[PDB]
Curated annotation (Swiss-Prot):
Chain sites annotated for binding ADP: 83, 85-88
Lineage: Eukaryota, Metamonada, Diplomonadida, Hexamitidae, Giardiinae
Protein name: Kinesin-2a
Organism expressing this protein natively: Giardia intestinalis (strain ATCC 50803 / WB clone C6)
Domain Kinesin motor residues, every copy: 2-289
Consequence of gene loss (knockout): Knockdown of expression by CRISPR interference (CRISPRi) system results in significantly shorter membrane-bound portions of the caudal flagella.
Amino acid sequence: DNIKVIVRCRPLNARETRENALNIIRMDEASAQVIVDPRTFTFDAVYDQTSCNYGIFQASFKPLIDAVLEGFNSTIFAYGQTGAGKTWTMGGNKEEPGAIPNSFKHLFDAINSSSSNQNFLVIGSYLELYNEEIRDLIKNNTKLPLKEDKTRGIYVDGLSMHRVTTAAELSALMDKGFANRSSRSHSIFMVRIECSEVEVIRVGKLNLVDLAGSERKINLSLSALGLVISKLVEGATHIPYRDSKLTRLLQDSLGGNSKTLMCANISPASTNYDETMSTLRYADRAKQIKNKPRINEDPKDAQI
Ligand SMILES: Nc1ncnc2c1ncn2[C@@H]1O[C@H](COP(=O)(O)OP(=O)(O)O)[C@@H](O)[C@H]1O
Ligand SMILES: [Mg+2]
């Protein structure tokens, strides 16, 4: 079905507070509405300044992680202007983990609760896309090329893959990647979950995306993402996935074989009215995208 879309408004920050900016954002979480002081938008869920990372995970992100555990491909991407809260939402901190570490914990808590009829193989990868160049954030290898075939789909040739058996191991990979990692770059932490159940192998690919800032080549991928979304919503004959590395990497999450959720991060500051309006209108369009997710069984690429 359609791509899920949520909006998260953070609290006013120090800069905004000291410059006497006013909060122009109102939300009605019961009706999933965001109001810009007024222009009103309705999404799948809205989160105001009182929302915490854990709550957003349980209500909006968790279902996407459960989908991968079931054999579906899932993608969660954070979109919004620099400073809006994409990284805080996707990564958070040790005290208040974001979507990525929360997903790691949930994935393994689920696997540990599985019966003897299921055996799992979890593989992690982490990349940064900047100036149309792909960097392996774990090995810090640069300019990795994209390759694509029938028995693997789109992939980064040379990107290091890491087998992990605990959430702590996955978090350690993220920690190492972060140490090497920005406002103009995109990051994607990938988790491949293969499950052998008894005889039947299923594989789900999870993409945790933290996009480059949307405010106001370096921006080729961001521009291509917008075009791809527009073409999809308009029912165009040709979807320009090939226009950028980002849209090729996420081709399945955009109108393809995947369950996808977009988190549109916004600032509540009056000073950011224009960018907030842009982000919301962008998100409003994205929710019209329809995907065709399917369970991926017995793939000729299964590494288990
Ligand atoms: N929901 C939130 N609650 C509290 N602080 C937040 C929130 N979202 C962002 N911040 C803070 O504001 C700053 C910018 O957030 P960040 O996520 O890094 O922005 P970006 O969208 O550029 O990735 C950080 O210092 C972060 O701690
Ligand atoms: Mg960031």
